[PDB]
Amino acid sequence: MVNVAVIGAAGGIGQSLSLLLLRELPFGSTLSLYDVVGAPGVAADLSHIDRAGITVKHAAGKLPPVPRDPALTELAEGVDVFVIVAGVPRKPGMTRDDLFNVNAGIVMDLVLTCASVSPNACFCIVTNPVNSTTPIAAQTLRKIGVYNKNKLLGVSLLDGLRATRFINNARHPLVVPYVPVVGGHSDVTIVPLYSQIPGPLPDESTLKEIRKRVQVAGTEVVKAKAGRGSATLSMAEAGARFTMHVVKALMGLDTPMVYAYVDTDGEHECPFLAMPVVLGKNGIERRLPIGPITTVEKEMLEEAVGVVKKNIAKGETFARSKL
Amino acid sequence: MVNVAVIGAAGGIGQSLSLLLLRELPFGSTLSLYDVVGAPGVAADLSHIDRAGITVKHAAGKLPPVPRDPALTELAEGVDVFVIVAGVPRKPGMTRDDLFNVNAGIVMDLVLTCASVSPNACFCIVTNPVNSTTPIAAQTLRKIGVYNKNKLLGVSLLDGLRATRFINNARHPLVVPYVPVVGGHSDVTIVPLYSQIPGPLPDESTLKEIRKRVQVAGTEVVKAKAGRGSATLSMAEAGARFTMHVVKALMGLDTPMVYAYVDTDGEHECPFLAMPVVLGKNGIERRLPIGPITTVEKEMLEEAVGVVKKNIAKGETFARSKL
Amino acid sequence: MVNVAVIGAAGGIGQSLSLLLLRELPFGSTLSLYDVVGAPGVAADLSHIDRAGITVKHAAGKLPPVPRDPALTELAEGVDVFVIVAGVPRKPGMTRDDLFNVNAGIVMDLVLTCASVSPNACFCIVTNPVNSTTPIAAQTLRKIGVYNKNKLLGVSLLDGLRATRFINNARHPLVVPYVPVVGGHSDVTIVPLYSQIPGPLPDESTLKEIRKRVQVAGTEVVKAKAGRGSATLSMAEAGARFTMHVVKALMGLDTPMVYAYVDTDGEHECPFLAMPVVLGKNGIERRLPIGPITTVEKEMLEEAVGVVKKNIAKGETFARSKL
Amino acid sequence: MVNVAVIGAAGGIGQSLSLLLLRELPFGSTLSLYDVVGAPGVAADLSHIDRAGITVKHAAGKLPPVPRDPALTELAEGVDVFVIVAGVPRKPGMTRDDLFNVNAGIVMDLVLTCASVSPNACFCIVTNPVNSTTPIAAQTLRKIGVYNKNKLLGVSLLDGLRATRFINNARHPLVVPYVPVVGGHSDVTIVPLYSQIPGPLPDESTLKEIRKRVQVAGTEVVKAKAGRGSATLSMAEAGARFTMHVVKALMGLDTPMVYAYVDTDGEHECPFLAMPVVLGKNGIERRLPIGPITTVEKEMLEEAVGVVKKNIAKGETFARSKL
Amino acid sequence: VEEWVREYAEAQEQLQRVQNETNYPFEPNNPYMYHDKPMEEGIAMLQLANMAEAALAFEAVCQKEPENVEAWRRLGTTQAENEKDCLAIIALNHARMLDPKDIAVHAALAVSHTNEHNVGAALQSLRSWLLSQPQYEHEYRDCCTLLYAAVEMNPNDPQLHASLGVLHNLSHRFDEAAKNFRRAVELRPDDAHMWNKLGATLANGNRPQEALEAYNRALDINPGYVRVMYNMAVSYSNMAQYPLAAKHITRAIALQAGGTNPQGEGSRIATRGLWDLLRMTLNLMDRSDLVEASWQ
Amino acid sequence: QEQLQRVQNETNYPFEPNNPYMYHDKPMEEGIAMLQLANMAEAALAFEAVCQKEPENVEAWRRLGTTQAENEKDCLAIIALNHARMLDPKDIAVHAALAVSHTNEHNVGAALQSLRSWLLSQPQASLGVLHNLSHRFDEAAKNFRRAVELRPDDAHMWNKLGATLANGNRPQEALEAYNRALDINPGYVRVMYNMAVSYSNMAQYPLAAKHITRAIALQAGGTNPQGEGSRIATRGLWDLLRMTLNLMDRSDLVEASW
């Protein structure tokens, strides 16, 4: 059937994501858990549960992160979908900007090792920062020798969920399903589009307030949790839903429309943005334009894409600096 | 409508169970969370997910453990089900006696504070020494003055899930939904009745090894984790299913039968045992007899009841402690 | 908890509708049936479908029709939702007016009986034509004096369904869940607002064709059915789905938003037009406006309301000849 | 990719079964309706459903019953599952003298025409004389020769579903998912099993009447309907459920165990019986024994074996009389 | 006191007796009981419109011995012509048991059942009317086939054609019934009732302009046909001429109870139904000052 | 009684309106003398009889708190000793006695705060009390056992030792070695409570009911049957009896509970 690797589990965003996928994956699906420490414990704990028909395979690594770990290459044959979340805040007290470098370096070797044996497989990176790691992954795939812009999906459904929850919270006896979001996935680069949904809209002041609340919530959620760490539950939900959509599309039982951070293929000046896209039996099948945009909120997209230019440029400059 | 209240939100079990529970609740739920440390953070994390229609409430007391915390008698108003999931799960090399000592006081305080605000609320016990803490909860309810012998259910579905997972693997294509289990929970008080299910049973020699594997699973899980914790998700998954069954029966749109640690009116000599029961709009209505039993099963059952006699002795009798 | 009642059972839109409702009606509820002929038929026939928690009742009547049937005003007591789905077959001739001249009268009878025993039950009209039958039902309710405009739902979703199925077949890989349709429910009284739907949208010429077809579809069926029959099946699913929308809400398990044929409380003229509405536990609680439309759509709407203005006048004036 | 073709969707067991099959089939499936008179009408009727992913098609046959009409041959190309529903329209026949004869020719046509183009088809028999047509169907397959014991099947859920409903009425809330009925599909041959049911089974005196009801349950349907048709919706629903189970088994998404009229090779001396069978992604994989029974079922099985043998003897006697 | 106590005591006793025997809840206010024995009041009256108190006089004379066919046919005919077809059914059903004679019975009874909705009993009544006739004495299908088996036989036969037209009115086939009444009336252009039944099959045929042309001069025959003016009211409502329709319905309510009704009220004999014609009429004008508030 | 109302208002210490003694211009000598005989229950009512008049510490509040802690109602003791602590933050015995009173029911951090207060007032059994906060009962017994040999003159100094082998399983030692502590100053309701608990832990022992009945009897001695006077704070064994009779053998004395 399928094989959804959840490589990077047993730590943060993982575990919960594996638990959600265990009771959601179609019959006959096979899971794969990988981590540097504690992976056998999670594998044993996630093997006594009901719903027979799903088998669990796992492998562990070597404490010293030998790049290109031979054990990880064993947990790569037959995999079709990869969920790369190597998230760890090893220096929470000392908050300074080397987390970008650490995460990028980890993702580089991880994606290189994964793609060295399984080229024709989708990628669903959920490793902050998702704005600059995706160009790094594209550069690594280009260096490997095989690359496909069709399957390089960057999870961004968290912004959509956050916008939909807020928009369904003031309008009391009225609920909506999804809300479009176009841009990047970091602070100033996200802008909701409250002009493509049915029903009357509220006044401009509350619209701006909701826009700002969706604009910035990471600092609020971090401050709420005593500054200990970021949010790990909503991210797991968004990742599980996105990978479930992907695995459903690959099996050929649904062709849904989502909002993805993928290469624009020349349809937009910046060759990376969160646009509508419909999945298919072999990946991305048809990109779609953004559509009509109100001129009031049109100015925001200019500075959003301007910041995206700098983020992507830093992404490629760092990637070429190493190799 | 319903109001599920999980006690002990933060941790490793309470947050995973809460996340699993806030994905298939009936429309109109008012889930509430409590913990000494954390709790605001988990509430903020869980307030961003989509599917509006559920209101999330949270409370948190002071860090120093104070008996009868005011937050409990601030949030415990208007509650239907109380899922008590608390007690230290990071058991060190110390024996079982210390675990009972550290869990009995916590259970006593929690039940004493909880009962005085909503007597007409079902209780779902999750703590590991359930065999011994169920009579403790019975004492806590009795000494207050309000005690219903049909609203004191205990979680035991983990053993049944393990048993059915172990059997569904042997017989391959054939699959079953449930497997009966009798007795208790702790060490040897478990007897799975394998002769009451359809299909040709396997060889007698194997049945002993499957029974032994079912009896001994916690030690295997602990050894697989190298003594760095316990099964923090399996107990967080079956509990969610049990709570869903209880709340669905309470709403009236179901009439299921489950195997739960309950009080035996007449029937068996032991005051407590794991026998099939049926829920209802009020509570436990029709306790069911065990039925036909095989000779080896009946001798294992008499050994189990002999053990649970001493377990209930170490339980209902313990009274209190003072210097 | 709820007691749904079907009046036009077993004719050609009966047994199918009752079967569809049986497989989706919530647990712990009762379903009723009634017809002049075949009442002791399909009612006992569906008693062999287990669906545990569902009880089926029935009531018969004399073959010669009698106003205010004594047997009918026995089962009507205790119901909560009514589905007046009784009609007449379509003979080859069936010129206008005369057919209506029959279909009105029976409907009036089917309102007078079940009105003095439960003036608190949500109603529903399915009989063809529906643009003129709804005013007859409104005036019949107004004769007694117990009339609530919030519960006068008229089935026109067959229209909604139709539109989606066509606009989802042109724009192929893309798919939309629902497409707004304001107006009435017949010929040139149906305006499919295809410009409030998410997506890129086809060209003009095409849009035109698709539009008109939505308006002249029944014909196809009637024709294809070699000058006999009509459109039972389709007209049943619509009815079923809608009924549920109402039921769930009333109990408090969802707040859906539909598009019904409910009198306009001071809105755009034409006091019996079709506009989007949101349901609730008391019927209809809010009426959304039509919203922005383009020049092409307003060309049809400015003349469609004129046709409705004629049928609405012919409706609430029914007094054939007394004598 | 599954292709379900309904042959004979004209009667009450027709259109209704086809409609139940639609709206619930897996995505990407195709439904091929067939009939002799009225196929275009029902095809156009169902072509207005929001059920994207299905491409329902029709090919009507000539009114004269010419054997091997080319119209059915084109439709029956590339079909994976066949269901046979056509036969006597409403059974106006006096007795078994002609019903066993008039249905014989239509069975000949509807089996040989489909088998001549689709060898691997897994035909399902729904006609009223199952106990006689199933050996006849096996003979028709063996004539040209594609026969495989794991392919031919006959629906039997009607008796089991009917028996399940009876018990839940008598006993308060002990819901039993299914009861293992054994025998054939006619009169006294039916026998319900009650020993393999958890709970306090009732006394033999009252249970005797319940056993009598299942065997005689077909009579009162005609009695209440004044001899105008019988068992229309129930047989269609049971057939649709069985077809869905078979389709899911062929899809590899489930491997359940059911009770179907099958060619029991070995075990019981009868060639064709009703023994429990598990479904895999090939047809039928492993057969199961009847299991232990108490005293009263022994004589019932002793009578049922003789009745089944006589019915199969009658079928084989009619066999090779025209071919 | 004794000289006249019986005249009232026995009167009330026999009134209550007749009340509880079969049917017909008599109006309490007669002011006719002491001078109703010369039954010829109904023959002296009703010849020039004013067919309201004649029904009261016939009721006053029918409160006596019930074995008179005239006393039980005149009430039915007058009440049917007065558009109060509620007690007419029960009164003529009581007249049924007084032998199958008086072929006026079973003739208006077919009309009486088809008045509101009674399809089934109308056919039986019409069949009983047909069989109670020895000149040509030699299930809707069978009932209409029996009538069709005569047609030319007894060509004039105005009552047979009237029955045929009434039966055709029940089949929702007003098109052919229209030309049936059109050629039937010319045979006897004296009785306005046959004209009235004509207008109905034109009123139901969505041709009110012609239908009124049938009623108007027919009203000149007898200006007491409340049914005719009810038809004018409904036709004017259909022409969207709402003020004239309101005037006509007000005149209809005034004329129908145009007698001692305010001082002779009974059980209202469901006259509310006729009042319902006024109701929703102002719904076209939205006369918020009055609307439903004056339903008493 | 106006002074009683005023001191009830200013001080959270409850005062029983029933005052059999009252007056007693010099309460201290007989209050400390008669407790040497037995039944300090009268002695506590004597010390409150002087604490009502004089809010000054003068060892009065300290002795009252110690005697109240000796009886098994160690909830009034905390609030009674808090007033002495705040008035005189110099003595170490008030803080030492507050540490055990807090740690009795459930107070963990309060005991830590109290022991710091006790230790800070020192220019130059605590280890056992600290171990009682944790669950190191096996290694906790060492310091208590050592402390016995040093001052074998006060029962309380080893009474806390007995409960050490009462709340951590193994109902021994105190079961037979230090169950005679009543021989000096018999008022230790705590000793009878611990003995009854240990008897219940071991086996049935119907005589445990008689023992606890006698414990309540001398606890409810003279001048105790006085009216409500906000004396619900006793509670305690009033519940525990409803336990035993409901479970052990009788199951028919439940009505004899209110």
PDB file of N, CA and C in Angstrom, chain B residues 158-208:
ATOM      1  N   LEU B 158      -7.065  -1.501  28.484  1.00  0.00           N
ATOM      2  CA  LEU B 158      -5.729  -1.707  27.931  1.00  0.00           C
ATOM      3  C   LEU B 158      -5.398  -3.190  27.826  1.00  0.00           C
ATOM      4  N   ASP B 159      -5.747  -3.966  28.856  1.00  0.00           N
ATOM      5  CA  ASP B 159      -5.491  -5.401  28.826  1.00  0.00           C
ATOM      6  C   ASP B 159      -6.272  -6.079  27.707  1.00  0.00           C
ATOM      7  N   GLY B 160      -7.537  -5.693  27.526  1.00  0.00           N
ATOM      8  CA  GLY B 160      -8.325  -6.263  26.444  1.00  0.00           C
ATOM      9  C   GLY B 160      -7.776  -5.913  25.075  1.00  0.00           C
ATOM     10  N   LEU B 161      -7.343  -4.662  24.897  1.00  0.00           N
ATOM     11  CA  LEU B 161      -6.735  -4.261  23.633  1.00  0.00           C
ATOM     12  C   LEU B 161      -5.469  -5.059  23.357  1.00  0.00           C
ATOM     13  N   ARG B 162      -4.623  -5.236  24.375  1.00  0.00           N
ATOM     14  CA  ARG B 162      -3.421  -6.042  24.197  1.00  0.00           C
ATOM     15  C   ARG B 162      -3.772  -7.479  23.831  1.00  0.00           C
ATOM     16  N   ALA B 163      -4.771  -8.054  24.506  1.00  0.00           N
ATOM     17  CA  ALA B 163      -5.152  -9.437  24.239  1.00  0.00           C
ATOM     18  C   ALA B 163      -5.668  -9.606  22.814  1.00  0.00           C
ATOM     19  N   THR B 164      -6.545  -8.702  22.366  1.00  0.00           N
ATOM     20  CA  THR B 164      -7.086  -8.838  21.017  1.00  0.00           C
ATOM     21  C   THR B 164      -6.027  -8.552  19.959  1.00  0.00           C
ATOM     22  N   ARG B 165      -5.101  -7.626  20.225  1.00  0.00           N
ATOM     23  CA  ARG B 165      -4.003  -7.402  19.291  1.00  0.00           C
ATOM     24  C   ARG B 165      -3.117  -8.635  19.183  1.00  0.00           C
ATOM     25  N   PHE B 166      -2.826  -9.283  20.314  1.00  0.00           N
ATOM     26  CA  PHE B 166      -1.997 -10.484  20.280  1.00  0.00           C
ATOM     27  C   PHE B 166      -2.711 -11.625  19.568  1.00  0.00           C
ATOM     28  N   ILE B 167      -4.025 -11.746  19.668  1.00  0.00           N
ATOM     29  CA  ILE B 167      -4.655 -12.888  19.009  1.00  0.00           C
ATOM     30  C   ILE B 167      -4.851 -12.618  17.525  1.00  0.00           C
ATOM     31  N   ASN B 168      -5.252 -11.402  17.169  1.00  0.00           N
ATOM     32  CA  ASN B 168      -5.523 -11.070  15.769  1.00  0.00           C
ATOM     33  C   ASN B 168      -4.295 -11.232  14.897  1.00  0.00           C
ATOM     34  N   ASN B 169      -3.137 -11.385  15.517  1.00  0.00           N
ATOM     35  CA  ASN B 169      -1.916 -11.501  14.761  1.00  0.00           C
ATOM     36  C   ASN B 169      -1.688 -12.948  14.434  1.00  0.00           C
ATOM     37  N   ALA B 170      -1.912 -13.824  15.404  1.00  0.00           N
ATOM     38  CA  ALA B 170      -1.730 -15.250  15.177  1.00  0.00           C
ATOM     39  C   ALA B 170      -2.638 -15.680  14.063  1.00  0.00           C
ATOM     40  N   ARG B 171      -3.912 -15.865  14.356  1.00  0.00           N
ATOM     41  CA  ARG B 171      -4.841 -16.163  13.293  1.00  0.00           C
ATOM     42  C   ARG B 171      -4.727 -14.980  12.372  1.00  0.00           C
ATOM     43  N   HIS B 172      -4.297 -15.184  11.137  1.00  0.00           N
ATOM     44  CA  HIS B 172      -4.043 -14.022  10.271  1.00  0.00           C
ATOM     45  C   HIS B 172      -5.247 -13.339   9.633  1.00  0.00           C
ATOM     46  N   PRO B 173      -5.782 -13.900   8.539  1.00  0.00           N
ATOM     47  CA  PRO B 173      -6.855 -13.148   7.888  1.00  0.00           C
ATOM     48  C   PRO B 173      -7.981 -12.854   8.857  1.00  0.00           C
ATOM     49  N   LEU B 174      -8.335 -13.817   9.691  1.00  0.00           N
ATOM     50  CA  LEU B 174      -9.446 -13.635  10.607  1.00  0.00           C
ATOM     51  C   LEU B 174      -9.157 -12.521  11.589  1.00  0.00           C
ATOM     52  N   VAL B 175     -10.137 -11.660  11.838  1.00  0.00           N
ATOM     53  CA  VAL B 175      -9.959 -10.555  12.771  1.00  0.00           C
ATOM     54  C   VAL B 175     -11.144 -10.399  13.711  1.00  0.00           C
ATOM     55  N   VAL B 176     -10.892 -10.022  14.958  1.00  0.00           N
ATOM     56  CA  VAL B 176     -11.967  -9.847  15.927  1.00  0.00           C
ATOM     57  C   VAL B 176     -11.978  -8.435  16.503  1.00  0.00           C
ATOM     58  N   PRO B 177     -13.116  -7.974  17.031  1.00  0.00           N
ATOM     59  CA  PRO B 177     -13.272  -6.615  17.565  1.00  0.00           C
ATOM     60  C   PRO B 177     -13.035  -6.515  19.065  1.00  0.00           C
ATOM     61  N   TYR B 178     -13.280  -7.595  19.805  1.00  0.00           N
ATOM     62  CA  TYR B 178     -13.124  -7.561  21.252  1.00  0.00           C
ATOM     63  C   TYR B 178     -12.805  -8.956  21.769  1.00  0.00           C
ATOM     64  N   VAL B 179     -12.151  -9.002  22.931  1.00  0.00           N
ATOM     65  CA  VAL B 179     -11.799 -10.248  23.593  1.00  0.00           C
ATOM     66  C   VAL B 179     -12.120 -10.100  25.076  1.00  0.00           C
ATOM     67  N   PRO B 180     -12.917 -10.991  25.666  1.00  0.00           N
ATOM     68  CA  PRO B 180     -13.270 -10.844  27.083  1.00  0.00           C
ATOM     69  C   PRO B 180     -12.063 -11.008  27.994  1.00  0.00           C
ATOM     70  N   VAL B 181     -12.109 -10.315  29.131  1.00  0.00           N
ATOM     71  CA  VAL B 181     -11.085 -10.413  30.165  1.00  0.00           C
ATOM     72  C   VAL B 181     -11.767 -10.309  31.523  1.00  0.00           C
ATOM     73  N   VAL B 182     -11.254 -11.051  32.505  1.00  0.00           N
ATOM     74  CA  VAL B 182     -11.873 -11.156  33.818  1.00  0.00           C
ATOM     75  C   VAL B 182     -10.801 -10.946  34.881  1.00  0.00           C
ATOM     76  N   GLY B 183     -11.228 -10.483  36.055  1.00  0.00           N
ATOM     77  CA  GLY B 183     -10.347 -10.407  37.202  1.00  0.00           C
ATOM     78  C   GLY B 183     -10.004  -8.996  37.628  1.00  0.00           C
ATOM     79  N   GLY B 184      -8.726  -8.644  37.530  1.00  0.00           N
ATOM     80  CA  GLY B 184      -8.272  -7.318  37.897  1.00  0.00           C
ATOM     81  C   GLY B 184      -7.277  -6.750  36.906  1.00  0.00           C
ATOM     82  N   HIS B 185      -6.318  -5.978  37.393  1.00  0.00           N
ATOM     83  CA  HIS B 185      -5.390  -5.301  36.494  1.00  0.00           C
ATOM     84  C   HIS B 185      -3.922  -5.485  36.858  1.00  0.00           C
ATOM     85  N   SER B 186      -3.589  -5.532  38.149  1.00  0.00           N
ATOM     86  CA  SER B 186      -2.229  -5.220  38.585  1.00  0.00           C
ATOM     87  C   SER B 186      -1.140  -6.165  38.084  1.00  0.00           C
ATOM     88  N   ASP B 187      -1.081  -7.394  38.604  1.00  0.00           N
ATOM     89  CA  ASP B 187       0.030  -8.286  38.277  1.00  0.00           C
ATOM     90  C   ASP B 187      -0.412  -9.612  37.674  1.00  0.00           C
ATOM     91  N   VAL B 188      -1.261 -10.372  38.365  1.00  0.00           N
ATOM     92  CA  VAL B 188      -1.628 -11.721  37.945  1.00  0.00           C
ATOM     93  C   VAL B 188      -3.140 -11.855  38.019  1.00  0.00           C
ATOM     94  N   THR B 189      -3.811 -10.745  38.303  1.00  0.00           N
ATOM     95  CA  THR B 189      -5.256 -10.689  38.446  1.00  0.00           C
ATOM     96  C   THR B 189      -5.982 -10.626  37.108  1.00  0.00           C
ATOM     97  N   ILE B 190      -5.309 -10.987  36.020  1.00  0.00           N
ATOM     98  CA  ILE B 190      -5.849 -10.887  34.671  1.00  0.00           C
ATOM     99  C   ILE B 190      -6.035 -12.293  34.124  1.00  0.00           C
ATOM    100  N   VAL B 191      -7.253 -12.615  33.697  1.00  0.00           N
ATOM    101  CA  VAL B 191      -7.486 -13.869  32.987  1.00  0.00           C
ATOM    102  C   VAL B 191      -8.285 -13.576  31.722  1.00  0.00           C
ATOM    103  N   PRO B 192      -7.679 -13.689  30.540  1.00  0.00           N
ATOM    104  CA  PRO B 192      -8.434 -13.475  29.300  1.00  0.00           C
ATOM    105  C   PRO B 192      -9.138 -14.757  28.878  1.00  0.00           C
ATOM    106  N   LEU B 193     -10.448 -14.660  28.664  1.00  0.00           N
ATOM    107  CA  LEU B 193     -11.260 -15.813  28.283  1.00  0.00           C
ATOM    108  C   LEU B 193     -11.213 -15.936  26.765  1.00  0.00           C
ATOM    109  N   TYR B 194     -10.325 -16.803  26.279  1.00  0.00           N
ATOM    110  CA  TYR B 194     -10.124 -16.997  24.849  1.00  0.00           C
ATOM    111  C   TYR B 194     -11.097 -17.992  24.230  1.00  0.00           C
ATOM    112  N   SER B 195     -11.845 -18.740  25.039  1.00  0.00           N
ATOM    113  CA  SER B 195     -12.759 -19.758  24.541  1.00  0.00           C
ATOM    114  C   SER B 195     -14.164 -19.229  24.283  1.00  0.00           C
ATOM    115  N   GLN B 196     -14.401 -17.936  24.489  1.00  0.00           N
ATOM    116  CA  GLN B 196     -15.716 -17.342  24.289  1.00  0.00           C
ATOM    117  C   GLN B 196     -15.813 -16.553  22.990  1.00  0.00           C
ATOM    118  N   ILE B 197     -14.801 -16.631  22.131  1.00  0.00           N
ATOM    119  CA  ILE B 197     -14.795 -15.890  20.873  1.00  0.00           C
ATOM    120  C   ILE B 197     -14.980 -16.861  19.713  1.00  0.00           C
ATOM    121  N   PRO B 198     -15.597 -16.440  18.612  1.00  0.00           N
ATOM    122  CA  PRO B 198     -15.754 -17.338  17.465  1.00  0.00           C
ATOM    123  C   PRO B 198     -14.424 -17.621  16.784  1.00  0.00           C
ATOM    124  N   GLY B 199     -14.382 -18.752  16.085  1.00  0.00           N
ATOM    125  CA  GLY B 199     -13.208 -19.149  15.346  1.00  0.00           C
ATOM    126  C   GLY B 199     -12.419 -20.238  16.044  1.00  0.00           C
ATOM    127  N   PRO B 200     -11.717 -21.062  15.263  1.00  0.00           N
ATOM    128  CA  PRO B 200     -10.907 -22.142  15.852  1.00  0.00           C
ATOM    129  C   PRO B 200      -9.733 -21.572  16.635  1.00  0.00           C
ATOM    130  N   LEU B 201      -9.677 -21.901  17.923  1.00  0.00           N
ATOM    131  CA  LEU B 201      -8.603 -21.427  18.775  1.00  0.00           C
ATOM    132  C   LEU B 201      -7.293 -22.131  18.426  1.00  0.00           C
ATOM    133  N   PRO B 202      -6.152 -21.490  18.702  1.00  0.00           N
ATOM    134  CA  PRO B 202      -4.861 -22.133  18.420  1.00  0.00           C
ATOM    135  C   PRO B 202      -4.538 -23.255  19.394  1.00  0.00           C
ATOM    136  N   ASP B 203      -3.332 -23.805  19.286  1.00  0.00           N
ATOM    137  CA  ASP B 203      -2.936 -24.935  20.113  1.00  0.00           C
ATOM    138  C   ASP B 203      -2.867 -24.537  21.584  1.00  0.00           C
ATOM    139  N   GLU B 204      -3.064 -25.529  22.457  1.00  0.00           N
ATOM    140  CA  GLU B 204      -3.098 -25.268  23.894  1.00  0.00           C
ATOM    141  C   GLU B 204      -1.752 -24.768  24.405  1.00  0.00           C
ATOM    142  N   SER B 205      -0.652 -25.314  23.878  1.00  0.00           N
ATOM    143  CA  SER B 205       0.670 -24.927  24.361  1.00  0.00           C
ATOM    144  C   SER B 205       0.933 -23.444  24.130  1.00  0.00           C
ATOM    145  N   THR B 206       0.539 -22.927  22.963  1.00  0.00           N
ATOM    146  CA  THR B 206       0.707 -21.503  22.693  1.00  0.00           C
ATOM    147  C   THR B 206      -0.127 -20.655  23.645  1.00  0.00           C
ATOM    148  N   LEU B 207      -1.364 -21.082  23.920  1.00  0.00           N
ATOM    149  CA  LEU B 207      -2.274 -20.277  24.729  1.00  0.00           C
ATOM    150  C   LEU B 207      -1.625 -19.857  26.040  1.00  0.00           C
ATOM    151  N   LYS B 208      -0.806 -20.736  26.622  1.00  0.00           N
ATOM    152  CA  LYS B 208      -0.073 -20.377  27.831  1.00  0.00           C
ATOM    153  C   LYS B 208       0.869 -19.204  27.584  1.00  0.00           C
TER     154      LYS B 208
END
